[PDB]
Amino acid sequence: AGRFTKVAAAVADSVVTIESVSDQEGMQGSGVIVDGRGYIVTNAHVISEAANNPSQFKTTVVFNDGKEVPANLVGRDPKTDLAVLKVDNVDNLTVARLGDSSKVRVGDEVLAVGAPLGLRSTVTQGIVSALHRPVPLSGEGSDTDTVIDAIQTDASINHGNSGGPLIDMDAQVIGINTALGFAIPVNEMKLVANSLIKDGKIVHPTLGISTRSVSNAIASGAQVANVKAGSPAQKGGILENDVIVKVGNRAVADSDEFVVAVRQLAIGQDAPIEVVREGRHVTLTVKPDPDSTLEH
Amino acid sequence: AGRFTKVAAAVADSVVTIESVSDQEGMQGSGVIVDGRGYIVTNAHVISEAANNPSQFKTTVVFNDGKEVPANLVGRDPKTDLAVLKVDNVDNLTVARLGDSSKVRVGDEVLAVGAPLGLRSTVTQGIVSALHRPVPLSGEGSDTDTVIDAIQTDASINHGNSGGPLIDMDAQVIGINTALGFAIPVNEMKLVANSLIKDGKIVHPTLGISTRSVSNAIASGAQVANVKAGSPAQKGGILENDVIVKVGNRAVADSDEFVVAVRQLAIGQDAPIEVVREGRHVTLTVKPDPDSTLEH
Amino acid sequence: AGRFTKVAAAVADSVVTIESVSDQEGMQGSGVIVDGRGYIVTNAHVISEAANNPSQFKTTVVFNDGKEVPANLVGRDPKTDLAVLKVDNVDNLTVARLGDSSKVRVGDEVLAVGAPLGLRSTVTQGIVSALHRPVPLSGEGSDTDTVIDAIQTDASINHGNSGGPLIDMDAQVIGINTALGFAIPVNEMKLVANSLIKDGKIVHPTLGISTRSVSNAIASGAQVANVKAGSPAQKGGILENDVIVKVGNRAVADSDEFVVAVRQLAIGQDAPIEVVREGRHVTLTVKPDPDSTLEH
């Protein structure tokens, strides 16, 4: 039995097809069983239509054995492109083994595994091409766009394995395949999926800033395009045309890294923002606000 | 010597360049030697121009040793994208070893091998991404479009290895590369190539139906778009707007699977077709006709 | 540690980020340390803007350890898409180990390694798909287009690893990644980089011919589209509409191979050119001129 054939077969029982159907449309994605109680992780694109139109869409989970079971949305995070479903009272679930994405290295051989019974399902193979790679993701429909620190791989990521797991050579989940490919790292998945299970919602920091990327010999980074009124950046002293070069402890190369670095800040705590303003370096102090004040 | 280098070198003598030339045009593809008498298998796209315009096109086979030899069309099957050529009285041919595509599993490492002396020739590597995957194929010019149960692979399939073999790690042919890539499985190739050698033609079942894919919460499958007059479906009771969900022993997910499932039926024998008609499940009995009545 | 993880980690210290910046723009590529004195090889596309606009662009080299150092252009060859930079008085450089591209075989596993600290950096994996493959390359801006005998690979070649090394399983450089991917072979790199270091310039043969590819049953090859006045082909007897089929000791399949074969000729020495002229085979004798008369 082939080296990858063994790994793909070892995780197949833990990967599921996620099907949302109305009486006029129907889409399919993949997900991974992450808890014996019936919790399933996918990406926010796979469920986007059912989450946004729950009156007309019904979501089911199809297992490796062919069983079809109703599924309910536990919670979703368009900002990290993650979501959690729940199947109730399903016995003998084969829960996937979650790895540690902090131990993943460039060159590691990986499999991007889609649901074995999906219509256009795929299983692809490659290596890890980059780590902590900020990548912009387009929201599927009415979902807002976002940027994530992704694991980059030259394994093909497509409709046939979107939402399925990125698997290392120990048959462990190291990532969730997004919609030259990218995956949400499993350690960030664990944090997001746990809070979506405790709270049904994730609260992310916000500053009230929109940026555009700039790269030149003076000052490269994320140039402040807009500051919202009454925003944390508004009170912290951030001004337009400022070129943000550092957010907290993370240097910011462009707008993509800016979005990701902001989400690493602590809500309600002072934090430094370094900018280049009219050719002058300036450090500012900002207290991020929660993006969802009622859930915080 | 590399693991894949050994396999690619082991099959090179069995892979040939197929060149068809007129006095104003010329194209190249790949093929594989499948019988010591000089029979060579390629896909129907590679020869399409010479088969359709034999008065102006001449076809030759170029071997690994550089020998160039005239080739004649034994037969072709646009419906399975397969074709057989013949070289006459060529000695010491290195016949390829044909595998068993029913033993191929998802994750198996494969090589998509093009003719070593072809102009744009390639050899690519990947894994098997899916099995029994219905894929639509566009006829090259005046050839009719078709759908086949393919082996899907993330090994690149391109002009440089089209018509060449898909090779497993035992240096065995498990498929024929088509024109994210697909290959005709070798077991289906054997059946088609044998009949093209006995009969010079393949006879496929037909029902007289055109379908369009549908996917919703009521009834997903292949919706009947048209029924030909006097067709087997016409006498079997199939009506327009019927959503076919099963053909024989094979469930039908969409139009792609419908085309493939029909070709698995027995000519002249009764067979069940399950449909959803105005929200009502109905089973029908159809006797498929041969698509080529004179060869049958 | 993974098989490819070890190789990628072993060469990382020898791969550098190459950053050219003006006060309004900035681009990044990869390069490889090839000599302890501080010589770095990249492709001509990576530096194209700084080489063409040196008054406004500044080039730096970023090492694996994060050190940033000024770099100076030693020389470039748009015709082979190669270039050499120099860092001065940098100690403890990890020089890459240069392989022998003549020992590379089809199917060899390779890594296309980009600079570890580059913004969009990638490391991709594949096999060698073809050897001595003439490929046309578009000049980046005002640089002239060219054709090279490349190593073809199904490892992804992109902006994130352009200019970085193509690495074999012995952690040796066998090629330079260009801008389904292609790399300049290391043996041709050695010749070009050495002359760019001795002379600051490379001198290539020229005949004064422009060709277009032709492929038919009469005569396939590179059809002479234009002959420059006073050119070596002009004095050698080459005429328009001639279909060149051999240049020196190398048969010419199309215009791509013609460009490459011409560059293999000896400057100032008689050489045969075989053509098909009005359906008649004709051999001609041409004495190539240097493309840069003052440097020759």
Check whether domain B101-199 has CATH 2.40.10.10, yes or no: yes
Tokens matching residue C208: 């004064």
Answer for the pair B46, B29: CB distance below 8 angstroms, yes or no.
Answer: yes
Q: Which amino acid is at A17?
A: T
Architecture of domain A205-295: Roll (2.30)
Q: Which of A138, A140, A128, A262 is nearest to A182 (CA)?
A: A128
Q: What is the CA angle C112-C115-C116, rounded to 5?
A: 105
Residues of C in contact with B5 (CB under 8 A): 105-108
3-state secondary structure of B106: coil
Work out the number of other CB atoms within 10 angstroms of the CB of residue C292.
13
Q: How many Å apart are CA C21 and CA A214, to the nearest integer?
A: 12
Q: Which residue has the tokens 């009486």?
A: A23
What is the Cβ-side half-sphere exposure of residue B10, based on CA atoms within 13 angstroms? 17
Architecture of domain C3-86: Beta Barrel (2.40)
The pairing of strands C146-153 and C82-86 is: unpaired
Answer for the pair C123, A107: CB distance below 8 angstroms, yes or no.
Answer: yes
Probe site for chain A from B3, B4, B105, B106 (most A CB atoms < 10 A):
B106
DSSP tag of B247:
E
Angstrom CA distances, C8 to B3, B281, C5, C92, C215, stand at 19, 59, 5, 20, 42
Work out the number of other CB atoms within 10 angstroms of the CB of residue B136.
12
Active-site residues of C, by number, are 45, 81, 162
Bridge partners of A125? Answer: A111
* DSSP H helices in A22-144: 44-52
Q: Which residue has the tokens 């899916």?
A: B130
Nearest-by-Cβ selection for C2 from A154, A169, A216 = A169
Q: Which amino acid is at B41?
A: V
Answer for the pair A286, A258: CB distance below 8 angstroms, yes or no.
Answer: no
* DSSP H helices in chain A: 3-11, 44-52, 186-198, 232-236, 255-263
Q: What are phi and psi of A13, to 5 degrees?
A: -65, -20
Any residues with CB less than 8 A from the CB of C89 and at least 6 apart, and which? C38
Q: How many Å apart are CA B285 and CA B194, to the nearest integer?
A: 30
User: Shortest Cα distance from B131 to chain A (angstroms)?
Assistant: 9
In this complex, do C216 and B21 lie within 8 Å of one another by their Cβ atoms? yes
* DSSP H helices in chain C: 3-11, 44-52, 186-198, 232-236, 255-263
Catalytic pick from B20, B30, B45, B254?
B45
Q: What are phi and psi of C189, to 5 degrees?
A: -60, -45
Chain B residue with the nearest C-alpha to that of A59? B217
Q: How many Å apart are CA C175 and CA C164, to the nearest integer?
A: 9
User: Shortest Cα distance from B155 to chain C (angstroms)?
Assistant: 8
Cα B13 off chain centre by: 23
Q: How many Å apart are CA B193 and CA A235, to the nearest integer?
A: 76
Q: Which amino acid is at B114?
A: G
Q: How many Å apart are CA B168 and CA B85, to the nearest integer?
A: 23
Answer for the pair A194, A201: CB distance below 8 angstroms, yes or no.
Answer: no
Nearest-by-Cβ selection for C107 from B4, B26, B126 = B4
Nearest-by-Cβ selection for C4 from A109, A130, A216 = A109
In this complex, do A116 and B105 lie within 8 Å of one another by their Cβ atoms? no
Q: Which residue has the tokens 């392989």?
A: C99
Q: What is the distance in angstroms between the CA of the first residue and the CA of the last residue of chain B?
A: 50
Residues of A in contact with B169 (CB under 8 A): 2
Element (H, E) at C60: strand C58-62
Nearest-by-Cβ selection for B154 from A2, A23, A156 = A156
Q: Which of A52, A61, A58, A53 is nearest to A85 (CA)?
A: A61
Answer for the pair B44, B31: CB distance below 8 angstroms, yes or no.
Answer: no
Q: Give me the DSSP letters along C132-190.
A: EEEEEE--SSSSPPEEEEEEEESS---TTTTTSEEE-TTS-EEEEE---EEEEEHHHHH
Any residues with CB less than 8 A from the CB of A234 and at least 6 apart, and which? A208, A227, A228
Asked, colleague to colleague, whether B3-86 and B101-199 share their fold, the answer is: yes
Q: How many Å apart are CA C158 and CA C71, to the nearest integer?
A: 23
Answer for the pair A260, A149: CB distance below 8 angstroms, yes or no.
Answer: yes
Any residues with CB less than 8 A from the CB of C119 and at least 6 apart, and which? A253, A254, C28
Tokens matching residue B28: 């190249």
Nearest-by-Cβ selection for A130 from C9, C111, C121 = C121
Answer for the pair A149, A155: CB distance below 8 angstroms, yes or no.
Answer: no
CB contact burial C133-162 (16+ within 10 A = b; e otherwise): bbbebebbeebeebbbbbbbbbbbbbbbbb
Work out the number of other CB atoms within 10 angstroms of the CB of residue C278.
9
Answer for the pair C17, C40: CB distance below 8 angstroms, yes or no.
Answer: no
Chain C residue with the nearest C-alpha to that of B118? C130
CB contact burial B56-84 (16+ within 10 A = b; e otherwise): ebebbbbbbeeeeeebebbbbbbbbbbbb
User: Shortest Cα distance from B260 to chain C (angstroms)?
Assistant: 31
Instruction: Specify the length of chain A in residues.
Output: 296
Work out the number of other CB atoms within 10 angstroms of the CB of residue A44.
24
Number of H helices, E strands in chain A: 5, 21
Q: What is the CA angle C164-C104-C120, rounded to 5?
A: 20
Strands (E), A22-145: 26-35, 39-42, 58-62, 68-70, 72-77, 82-86, 109-113, 123-137
Q: How many Å apart are CA B32 and CA C25, to the nearest integer?
A: 52
Answer for the pair A141, A48: CB distance below 8 angstroms, yes or no.
Answer: yes
List residues in chain B touching A: CB distance below 8 A.
105-109, 126-130, 152, 154, 169, 180, 215-218, 220, 253-254
* DSSP H helices in A199-277: 232-236, 255-263
Q: How many Å apart are CA A290 and CA A79, to the nearest integer?
A: 13
Angstrom CA distances, C61 to A218, B134, C47, C64, C119, stand at 17, 50, 12, 10, 14
Q: How many Å apart are CA C103 and CA B147, to the nearest integer?
A: 42
List residues in chain C touching A: CB distance below 8 A.
1-9, 21-26, 58, 111, 116, 119, 121-126, 155-156, 158, 160
Chain A residue with the nearest C-alpha to that of C25? A216
Q: Which of A81, A84, A34 is nearest to A177 (CA)?
A: A81
Annotated active-site residue B256? The verdict is no
What is the Cβ-side half-sphere exposure of residue C105, based on CA atoms within 13 angstroms? 13
Cα B179 off chain centre by: 10
3-state secondary structure of B137: strand
Angstrom CA distances, B44 to B81, B261, C3, C95, stand at 5, 21, 40, 51
Give C65-71's long-range contacts (Cβ < 8 A, gap of 24+). Answer: C65/C13, C66/C117, C71/C18, C71/C40
Q: Which amino acid is at B216?
A: N
Residues of C in contact with B9 (CB under 8 A): 105-107
Q: Which amino acid is at C32?
A: V
Burial of A239 (0-12, 13-18, 19+ CB in 10 A): middle
Answer for the pair C23, A216: CB distance below 8 angstroms, yes or no.
Answer: yes
User: Shortest Cα distance from B13 to chain A (angstroms)?
Assistant: 25
Q: Which residue has the tokens 């050495």?
A: C194
DSSP tag of A214:
E
Q: How many Å apart are CA A156 and CA C84, to the nearest integer?
A: 34
Annotated active-site residue B154? The verdict is no
Q: What are phi and psi of A156, to 5 degrees?
A: -65, 125
Q: How many Å apart are CA A78 and CA A140, to the nearest integer?
A: 9
Q: How many Å apart are CA A122 and CA A161, to the nearest integer?
A: 6
In this complex, do B111 and C109 lie within 8 Å of one another by their Cβ atoms? no
Angstrom CA distances, B103 to A8, A111, A119, B106, B112, stand at 16, 21, 21, 10, 18
- Residue ranges per structural domain of chain A: 3-86, 101-199, 205-295
Q: How many Å apart are CA C101 and CA A148, to the nearest integer?
A: 39
Answer for the pair B121, B53: CB distance below 8 angstroms, yes or no.
Answer: no
3-state secondary structure of A296: coil
Q: How many Å apart are CA C133 and CA C188, to the nearest integer?
A: 13
Q: Which of A107, A93, A122 is nearest to A168 (CA)?
A: A107
Cα B195 off chain centre by: 14
Answer for the pair B196, B204: CB distance below 8 angstroms, yes or no.
Answer: no
User: Shortest Cα distance from A98 to chain B (angstroms)?
Assistant: 21
How many residue pairs from chains A and B have C-beta atoms closer than 8 A? 70
Answer for the pair C244, C275: CB distance below 8 angstroms, yes or no.
Answer: yes
Q: How many Å apart are CA C45 and CA A64, to the nearest integer?
A: 49
Q: How many Å apart are CA C238 and CA A73, to the nearest integer?
A: 75
